[PDB]
Symmetry: D3
Subunit: 201 residues, 6 copies
């Protein structure tokens, strides 16, 4: 997991010309003020008018510099009815979270040696789930109203590997002959899928 901190605080210096290191350099401690350990960025719902029908509001180190070196971050995800936070992976963190409003089908997938088992259930207000680092998972709003969840991670920068977007809409996209071989369908089907993700999100 993230390297442990070597002092109490180390607020990220996010200036575009800052020297680059693993993670982030820190602003001078003397200059951090009083408020770096607090945020209000998750107070409002994200805009669910997206192709997925969900919206992630990030609270990782990029959005909350006071988390730098501390080995934690958060996010909020809002869902339109029938919206999905699509199959995805966090490459660098375990996730733990709670549904706050509505009803979400939450699915978590084992790796090959676990038989690619799918564990899923309908998670309601106050109920929680845990997703091991690197494993594919999704949420789907099965309710008829807006749902949201609040999640936390054991990294300052868990990363998101969105499976559909990466598979079909990477920069630039994976070669069609790779995808036809991998997906066991003809070029036309792969081309249809790519056309859905050609817009970068």
């Amino acid at each position: 997991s993230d390297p442990d901190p070597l002092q109490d605080f180390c607020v990220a210096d996010l200036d575009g010309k800052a020297v680059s290191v693993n993670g982030h350099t820190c602003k001078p401690m003397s200059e951090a003020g009083d408020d770096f350990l607090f945020s209000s960025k998750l107070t409002k719902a994200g805009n669910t008018s997206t192709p997925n029908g969900s919206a992630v509001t990030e609270l990782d180190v990029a959005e909350w510099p006071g988390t730098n070196t501390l080995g934690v971050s958060m996010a909020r995800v809002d869902f339109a009815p029938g919206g999905t936070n699509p199959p995805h992976i966090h490459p660098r963190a375990t996730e733990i979270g709670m549904v706050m409003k509505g009803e979400l089908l939450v699915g978590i997938l084992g790796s090959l040696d676990s038989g690619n088992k799918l564990y899923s259930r309908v998670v309601r207000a106050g109920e929680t789930f845990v997703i091991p680092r690197g494993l594919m998972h999704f949420q789907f709003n099965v309710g008829k109203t807006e749902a949201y969840m609040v999640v936390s991670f054991n990294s300052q920068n868990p990363g998101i590997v969105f499976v559909p977007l990466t598979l079909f809409g990477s920069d630039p996209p994976i070669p069609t002959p790779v995808l036809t071989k991998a997906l066991r369908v003809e070029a036309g089907v792969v081309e249809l899928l790519k056309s859905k993700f050609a817009g970068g999100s």
Copy 2:
């Protein structure tokens, strides 16, 4: 931080006669069922009729065996008006959390080389805070109704070192001559403090 996992899942075997290891041994994977990655233990408010005026509902590995080896846990804390989650430390984890209802004065204290600085603010619904591993911190309900927060940690077993209870009500209590020297007050004052914590909580 907690050792990284060496497989997808490793549900804690919490049987009283289980062999003991760092953390917990795991139940046979073949026998875990479908539901170990989920919990509903935080759906209900804790009982705030306590001397502190707060109640912690734990969701660490002892309460959620499916978190074993995954490097995360959660808790809910409910507060009566004027209730406090008193100055305390988590010896093995950074904490990250959100106020869900009400208004909480949240205070976080730097260590000696940080001048023992106190950072505090009133945290309201949807607002968040982060507390580095090992640092003293508290919350106090400044509202006139019940408040609660939901918190997460980057350990399966963060630990709680309650400062008042440990200082005055440990098992058995710290010697009075140690406390008079350390607190710079006479025996009578130390004896008064001990009398408040003689009941073990």
Copy 3:
């Protein structure tokens, strides 16, 4: 990464009734013999007559018990002409590898904050590549003869999340309405994809 070792050697006890822990318990050191630090399991090519046209020969702790606690493993991957080791992720390890024979298009994909960038090139005998933990990647045999590579990981059990198989052929498969929403295509297309992975591999 994997927990560091706390002694020189700790050969995995892979008996089916062994107590379960994070990773593996160890056989009594006194009884390990001379040969646990060696293997010959990668001397022979895997069978490439598979739907993917590739075959992975594993040398993780399950196949090489002497690697237990040491934070490393290996594998060999053989490729028929036009064969692919399809888009996949190792949830718990960085991979580093070398092409030994033939010509492989090797592609490595950044996460969302890296713009899902695809980095790819044709890798020939003696040439190497590195794949950060948790990131999607693939190889495709662009040559007209059999190719193989030998790879190593900084985990005893890196895991494999095969993207096509997990997305369409998990146990049981992800719900069609989740996949239609996530992939932005009609049910018929999702059903076609599922039919290709209904056999478990």
Copy 4:
């Protein structure tokens, strides 16, 4: 624990205008000289004429730049007769130490799930003790002459959270209503305690 080193040596650059990172940047290796792996800072006793009756002489990375990245530090603590190194916590390290002269009552406190157990004994010359990261502990000179101990930590910067000073004399102090609720005594008692720590140490 502290991040492992990625090279042999990395002597801390402690210049006030140095770029800030987790831990410390390093001076150019070419310029470190011969003597960075050695110190003589603990050769002399600290001044025990303090309110606590003890004096800590630090040998962390701030005082010994050659320890930077190496995951270790030291300190010496000297005690007047009846002096205490008061209840405190090291947020980022386990401590291991030896009494060198005199007789010290050494107390170590478990966390809540350990029942806040107090383990204590009189430790004499050559005898040792170990204090897990984050746990409250103290020493008290029970002898009639000066005592000292030498301690080591598995961090370059373990931190010190002094319980009395932080509880009553932080910068600025914890609110009286928080302390009256937490300590179960009236304002007058809290005000008396604060008056003892108003001087910053």
Copy 5:
């Protein structure tokens, strides 16, 4: 082991005047190009016309900046007939490797509590070995033609402590009276050994 990465990529900035940190600072991500995850440095055999009769071709972070923060590296070692990669230690990594051509006697030595056991066998093409961090080991070409192996490590900078060269040819060499006491032979024998390593390699 090496600190985990806190982002996808962090290509090492190896400029001689770069600020120094544990490991390496990184070049601006925006400027890394496409090719940093690939190398061709191990395509050619090293020059075995050396006193050892072996040649190490390094592929650590100094030679492959794209490995920075990723916790892995590689090397190739080529051997003349009768050549040795002499008893040595990697202070910061476990090694895992495969013989590619020829026949190598590979020996791995336990530490004191393992009775300094020597485990050795003749390793041929395709066969593998694993060497725990910090343990002494060697390879010796027992064949009549050139051999080579390709090895990987779970560090970006494993380090090499060559035992003969360090014992007899360090900068400056270990004092003769230290070596006579340690090796239980007279000065003349130590002086003979030093004369063989006076050239720095």
Copy 6:
């Protein structure tokens, strides 16, 4: 470094038939008694009437079960006049230590990329030194009376790789043709060296 602890205490179960894991299983916490965090094993000097002229008194987890999982250990080393703690390596820990009595030449050696630099000085009572994990180092008593030092490590089981004993007296010894090639001397010289270490210490 050693895996972090997942609870307050975990006293090692050192029974010969205990299940084996990375490190040690723990005795039931309920049964540990009061005294596991303390030891008196270093109160007395070791017997310096040895070929080296030094004696190591170990206080690792094998000798101090209460250190299990806590990431620290200690040792005492006593030296006859002219005695040496010979060139050796700790494979799994950084060492930090203090001379308590007498005068010791302490030498610490960089790895290859550090030019195999030797850093050495005469260390007297109260003076300290630090030795990075995996690096060769030695001490030599330059005084005319007995010296001793007390050292600590950031591992519960640092290991000791004694260079002379391992090079010449391993179990069984390294082949003579390996040593003649590696040491650049004739068989007779290697045979002389082996004869000095044929007794196992």
